[model samples]
Structure formats: C-alpha cells, structure tokens
Target: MDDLTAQALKDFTARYCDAWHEEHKSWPLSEELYGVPSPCIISTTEDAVYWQPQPFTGEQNVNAVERAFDIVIQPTIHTFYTTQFAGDMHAQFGDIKLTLLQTWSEDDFRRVQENLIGHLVTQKRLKLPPTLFIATLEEELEVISVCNLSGEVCKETLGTRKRTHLASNLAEFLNQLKPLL
Candidate 1:
C-alpha cells in the first residue's frame, strides 16, 4: 500500500532541509548536550551537533503502544515517529509558532513513546478523547495534536478539555507547515 502519510512527512523533511541549507548553508545542528552523536554529523563545534537526517534501518511502528493502550493507534502517528531521526523542526501554522517533535536518536525514540503514553493517560484520566501530540506551541501549555479517533489535527490546551480544530488530517496539517528558518 502507498503510505501517503509517510510520503507527506518525507516531503516535509526534504523541504525543511532545503530551507535550512538556504538559510545557513549547512545541515541542521543541535546542542550536543541534547542531541545524540551520529554518523550523520559532518562536523561539529564543542557544543553543536551539525547533522543530516538519519533514516531508520529497521521496521518502525508503534504497535506496542496500540496493544498497551487497547486502542488502534492512528497510522499518521506511527509514520511521523518512525520515518526518520532528526532534531525537532520549527514551523509556522498561520500566526502560530510551533516546534514539531522528532527523535534525535534511538534512545529518544523510546522517550517519545513514553511521552505518548503520558499524554494518553492524562486524557483518559480526564475523560477526554485520546489525542497524540505532534508539536508544541510557542505559547506555554498548548500543543498541536492529532485526534486518535478521527485523525483530525487540533490545537489543545494542556490539562484541560479546550481544543480547537486545525486540520482534517496529519498529512493536510503537514502540508500547511512553513519552515521556520
């Protein structure tokens, strides 16, 4: 089957890298203290970890999460986390400034899964619908998350039921993201 969600993510990553090159003439960089050292690194300063995106070598899926949570996880969420390993991408959604969450290394991938569980647990405890967060808003306590039941993307306030619909699906939401360079 053609995975449109994965393809959209791939396209976004390409555009992001191109935009980064256009602005800095180099691959993306993160603080070494916060990033994993990898073969993708072309060079680095004492603190900077300049690197390209690292493709996953093994099959990547969040099936374990599906089983543990006792619900079918959205395909978009699986594709988003498994597609690649890189530093978070900054983007603009209209007037909103947000940071797309991404794995920086193998260890970080597990960390993301743990965080996902935390998000789900909170929603369950509050009697709210399950939603998986993809990005963090510049404004504190707000996140851009995908509704687990409908695949709709939304701007949700943390620890409350307040949520504003954003896009119909993850792919559509990703298409609207403008690289914050």
Candidate 2:
C-alpha cells in the first residue's frame, strides 16, 4: 500500500478502536471473527477455493490484524475486524435497515440473491452486477447493499429497481453511520 493509503488505514483503525471503546461498547456473541481467525478461508500467501469455520476462532491467519499486503480487502474491512466480529449487524435507519458485514463466501452470496429479488428486486436477475456485498440496507419496498464490483464500493440499489450509487466506498458510507443497536 502507498503511504497515503497506509496513513488512511492507520487513522481508520485508531478511530474504529476508539469508537468501539469510547462509544460502541460490548460485542455480540453470535458473530465470530473471520479472515485472520483460525477457520479463515482467505489466504495471503496462496489462493484458496473456499473457507470454513474451524472448531475455534482467532487462531487463523486470514484475519491479518496488522499492515496486511496484497489482498482485495481495503482498509475499511481490516479496521472493522479490529472492532467486532462481522455478522448481520442489522440496524434501522429511517425507512431502511442496514448492516455492515465482514465477508460472505461466494455460496452465501448466491443464496442472498435467491432470497432477495422477489422482495425488493425489480430488475431482471441476469442484469444485476456482480458485487461483493460489504453492507446491506432495505427500504419498505426494496433492499440495497453497499457493494464493490469493478472499482470503488457503493450503497447500490440492486435487483429490479433502477440502480443508484450511494457511497463511493466503505469509508464514506461508514462516515455517515450513527451509533445504533
């Protein structure tokens, strides 16, 4: 990573740790640590086809809590790991419900699509963009998620509705979030 990105990540991690201790106290039990944990599927040295949870957590190297290099994950995800385990952190904001997730296996992603669509999706299933969902939200009529596909991430309006880009990336999106349960 470049100096700029490294600095940004440093600042972000500090802020996340601060927020967790200063404001968002306590962690959920259901959510287990991924990536850098014992049962991690993502590898920094070699490519892997799939990941599975081990009998324990926090022993795996996939969670890389330090200045991790050469991975698709950005500073936002790395910092998030330092705070809490990723799970359905679903929170209600106005008419929408949103959650900042850690990561989902490719299989779970396809399952999410199947469960979606008939609910808030209005567009043809085939036309939907390939996305790595990091955060998800829902309106009364539909659901949306912050996703990354080609480049930067977005709080994209997906499914059958006219797509709209929300945030440019994970950091920007998190900047707009307030403390909630």
Candidate 3:
C-alpha cells in the first residue's frame, strides 16, 4: 500500500475503535448482573449480553474498536506473499473469490466506499484504498453487532429489521473492500 493509503488505514482503524467504545458502553450491564467486564450498561435477564462484541483479548478489550478494524477491515487489503509460487497464488485467488461471493451488492459497495473515504479524510486527512477501507469497516461492524445481539437475545432477533440494518451496514463495508477484478 502507498503511504497515503497506509495512513488512511490507520486513521480508519482508530475511528472504528471509537465507534466500538461508544456503542459498547452499555454492555454487560451492572457487575452484579453479568459479573464481567463489558462495554455495555443495559441489563438483560437472559443471562447474556447483546448488541456488542465480546472482547476476547486485551487488544480487543482495551482498543476494542480498533481490534474490530484489525479483525474486520484489514483483511480486505491486498494479500501479500513471500513467494509468487503457484500454490500461494492459488490460495490468494481462492480467498479473494470467497470475499467477492460473500459480499456482492452495488448499493452496499457504494455506501461503504463513501464511508471509508470520509473516514480517511476526517480521521487521518489521508487518501488511500477507499473501497477496501469501507468494506473492512462494514464487515467488522456487521460481525460485531450480529454476534453481540444474537448472543444476548434469541436467534429470532437475527431476523428483525434491526438485524438487517446491522447486516447491511456490514455488507456495505464488505462491498467497499470488493477485490479489484
């Protein structure tokens, strides 16, 4: 990646962290309720937490939002290899194909692209891979929201419009990351 793009990625990652922190402040509710460190404050009687990503590591917990960027957004970038061997090429090709298959929508693609570019400018005042950045953001947010909400509430909630919005947001991010073909 070019320097501008690299800087953009870094900035985008920071914003992602910010989003996570803002959204998860209400998670896990009271200590007596969930008895665990969480980013949420709302309580649920279901013995679960919803609408937030569960932190699996200090990287995830401390910079939980940035972790989302790392986990969800970074992968959309071009994959590099130490060798140009056929096997490596084939593996990379397969991964890219899967990504395309998983996230394919024009509207989503455009939305994610816009979000990513805006984020880059606002956060880092840098220019880079707008599509990839957006896609990663979308994917990260989608996965986190879905996993958090479903984990806390019943699976039925997954089918709700709220879930669709979450999925769309994620899909938009993924669309931005659509591999250049």
Candidate 4:
C-alpha cells in the first residue's frame, strides 16, 4: 500500500476500535491489545478482513469507503431471484434468498452476481448451474407459486411488513459504515 493508503488504514483501525468500544460499552483486553475480535478469523498477510465498530476518517481510504457506502445505500434499482438445484438426488435441500442491497452501475451489478456465484461455489452449494430471475418491486412483493422442472408447485409468500423490517435493519447496519465513509 502507498503511504496515503497505509495512513488511512491506520486511522480507520483506530476509529473502528473506538466505535466498537462505544457500542459494546465494555472493552476486552484481548481486542484492545491485539486488535483482534473475540471470535477472530484467520488473517492472511496479503488479504485480511476485520470488523470494528468505530468510525473512520482518513484521506486515501476514506473515498473508497465512501464509494462503497454509496453503492450500498443507493435506492433499489432492481430486485431479483436466483435458483440452483442439487444435482445428486440424495443431496439435502439447499437454497439461498438474496436481496439486491445496492448496485452502483451495470458493471457493478455484474460484479455482485459473480461474487455471489463465487460465494456459493466456495460454500459448496452450487451443485447445479445457477439461474438468475429478475423481477420488479411489484412482482417481488406478490405471493407467487414456483413450479419446479418436475412440476411441483411451491407457494411462496412475501410479507410487506416483514420485508420492510428487514430492509430497515439492513439500512441501519449500512449506516454504521458511514463513519468510515
């Protein structure tokens, strides 16, 4: 990383630590001294992911965070569904429900799709070729029945109030990233 990026990373870490402490109201010695959370994940030298609840204000990295937050909080451009079947008849039922959080652009949308594919692949859940089904807000909000290739009718219901609560919680979580932005 460049000097600017390095400085930004450090500043972000500090702010993240502070925010985490503030939110939790109690600071553990392990996190404060080692900069690692309670349930720490493996950290590679080149690529590492850590979660800190603090707000960050730095130069170089701040813009990246801002752009990320923008991509997250932007109004819903579209909604979609994806289905993947298990190839083996003996395999247990596995499915995923994804809500399009935000898409900055068409390219961004494609990237998100690819990332989701990779996610499923890494989890060993992509047994069959995944299918992407796009729908409008109205379409997604309705109760519909899905017919499988074997002619099975699966009645799926979408509750508006439940979806609204979920969306509200997600927005609040995204807002937590604003300090870093």
Candidate 5:
C-alpha cells in the first residue's frame, strides 16, 4: 500500500466508523451491527455483524483480491489488480450490512479461491470470475460479488439471472453498503 492509498484508506475508515456509530446510535444495532477484523481489502457478514476490509497488510501476504485476480480469467477482466473486493458483508440490499469491516486471513481467501471456485462455477454457471466465492445475499435472487478482475463491486440478479455492475469503485461500494436498521 502506497502512502496515498494508505492515507485514503485511513481517512475512509475513520469516516466510516463515525458514520456507523452515528447511524446505529443503539445496542445489538450499534454493537453487534458492524465488524472489520484488520486492514486489508475485503468485507464480510456472518451473523448480525458486518465486515469491511482495509488495505494495509494486503501486500503483507498474498492478498486474496490480488491473488484471486491474478489467477482469475474474466470475460472482460483486463486490468491488473488495482482495488477490487468481495465478502460476507451485511446490509438490507439482499443481505448487505454496513456494520463491520473485518480483515480476512490470506489462507482462508486462498482456500476459497481454490476450493469454492469450482462449486460456484457449477452453481452460478460462471465461465470465469476473479474470485470464486463472492458475497452471499439474503435475497434468493440477488448476489453481490467481485473478483480480482472486477473493477467495481458488482451484482448478479437471479430473478432475471443477469450480471450487473454495482458501485463505481471499491470506496463507493463500501460507503454505499450500509445497515438497513
């Protein structure tokens, strides 16, 4: 992470935390609402807590997004890994929660790429994706996703069963994805 990217990440997270507390303003909703483990570039949501990624230790090991993008063969995936993402984030939009921003482990990411991609390919009928396992949505019809090649956060609609782009960039997607509560 360069000084600029690092600074931008810090600034964004600082603002994000403030917004989270301000909006939540209460328990379970406030406390159990959001989460971010460390500083990398991915986010997730499991129970009620939400997750986001920072961009510090990303280069520390083999960053999931970076490596996933490295091996991924996208239809139009043509750019090098700049800043793309995916994960179990939370919220109302199908299952997105803007509560937490947790850092994920490198090994887990690699495992997903290696183990889960095939499963997803069979399930989603994806010819190729940057990262195999993207975010799981509550809506039976919608999916939030990204691969190393996904420049912007994206969504794949199941009702119509079509892929569509979501945010313009990582920062925007992170900012827009908020808790429904």
Candidate 6:
C-alpha cells in the first residue's frame, strides 16, 4: 500500500515537470532563497533565479522523526519528503489553491524534519492526533496533512481537533490537483 503511494507520488512529480516544460520550455520557477545553497539552482539572474527539481539524495526515511516522537509516521509522508528536491509546487484542488511542500536541498530536508517534529510535539501537547503537514491552505492555522494513524489526507485546522478528510491516501489527493501554471 505504501509502495503504491510512493510510486504515485513519483508519477505526479514527473507529470508536473512535464507540464512545466510543455508550457515554458524549462523547469518550474523557484525564486532564490537568498544565502541558501541548493542543488536545484539551474540558472540565476541579477534580479531573479530559477530552479529545477533534482532527485533528492538526502536521508530516505523519517526514522529520526519517529524515534524522537515515539510515533509511527505515515509511509506516504516519508515518500513525499524524500522523493524530490524542488521548491514548493503551486496547485489547486476544487476552489483551494495551495503549495505542495518540497525540500529544495539536503539541508532543507533536515529543516523539514525539524518542522515536522515541532508539529507533532504541539499536537501531543494539545492531545490531538498526530499529522504531518504537506501543504499550506492560504489561511492561517489551516493546512493539508496526512493523518498518521490512517494515512488519509485531510484539511485540518491547527490548534484544534477539527479536520475534514480529503482523500483516502496521498495519491488520490495528488491526482486531484491541477498545476497552477
């Protein structure tokens, strides 16, 4: 089951890159994060920079996160972070516009895991079920995440227990997204 989601994520990533190339004849646009070194940089200008998604070559599992939190991570969430090196992808589902979070480099991948740990810690303190965020909802305290217990994707309101299930799994949700190119 996890393998299915992992492969599905890889497929969607390829499709997204293809769409970008078809429309612009180049990789997806990623504005430079000043002072941050990223292997994704393919070109730069005085005023702007662009990046292409590289294959992620960082640690491939969320074992550190699991060890720290003493909780199991959803396998799909592990695949999401480890699958690529790219800036966040802009996408839409129904009326929602969001950015799918992705690591830009090996260093950034560690930061992502730190952020995940923080999220889980907060959830624990609040007595909420753990979730690892995957995207932003354009609204404060609202995000798209995978439910650790169920592997379902959800639209969640942070700082509360409120959640609306979005899909049975990450692949199903990814399939619903339309690139906002």
Query: Which candidate leads in TM-score?
Result: 1
Clashes of each: 0, 10, 14, 1, 23, 0
What is candidate 5's lDDT per residue for 1-181, written digit by digit as tens?
A: 2534333334444555455667774222222423533233333345443434433224433344335433544422221122322223245433453322222444444554454445444444545343422355656655565443555667765333356676655445545444443
- RMSD list, candidates in order: 1.6, 11.2, 19.6, 16.8, 7.6, 1.9
Badly placed stretches (over 4 Å) of model 4 are 1-102, 125-168
From the highest lDDT down, the ranking of the candidates is 6, 1, 5, 2, 3, 4
List runs of model 5 lying over 4 Å from the truth. Answer: 1-16, 23-89, 92-134, 147-150, 157-161
**TM-scores, one per candidate:** 0.92, 0.41, 0.20, 0.21, 0.45, 0.91
* Consecutive 10-residue window with the lowest summed lDDT within model 2: 48-57
- Residue by residue across 34-143, what tens digits does model 6's lDDT show? 45678888777665557776788957887889988889888788888887787878888788898888888888888888999999999999999789999997798899
> Any runs in candidate 2 off by more than 4 Å, and if so which?
1-25, 29-85, 90-96, 103-125, 138-141, 146-152, 156-158
TM-score of 4: 0.21
- Candidate 3 local lDDT, 1-181, one digit each (tens): 3544333333333343344457664322222324332333244555643322222221111122333343243322321100010000000111332211111123323333444334434333332222222112223332122222222210112112232232233323332332221
Candidate 2, residues 1-181, lDDT tens digits: the string is 3434324333443444344456545333233333333223423323322232222223222233122222243444434333322233444334445664543433343343344333223332455553444555544433444332433455454544345576666555555454344
* Residue pair clashes in candidate 4: 19-54
Candidate 1: lDDT of 56?
A: 63
Pairs that collide in candidate 1 are none
lDDT (C-alpha, whole model) for all candidates: 0.83, 0.40, 0.27, 0.26, 0.42, 0.83
Query: lDDT tens digits, residues 100-152, model 4?
Result: 22232233334545644443343234233221212112345432121212212
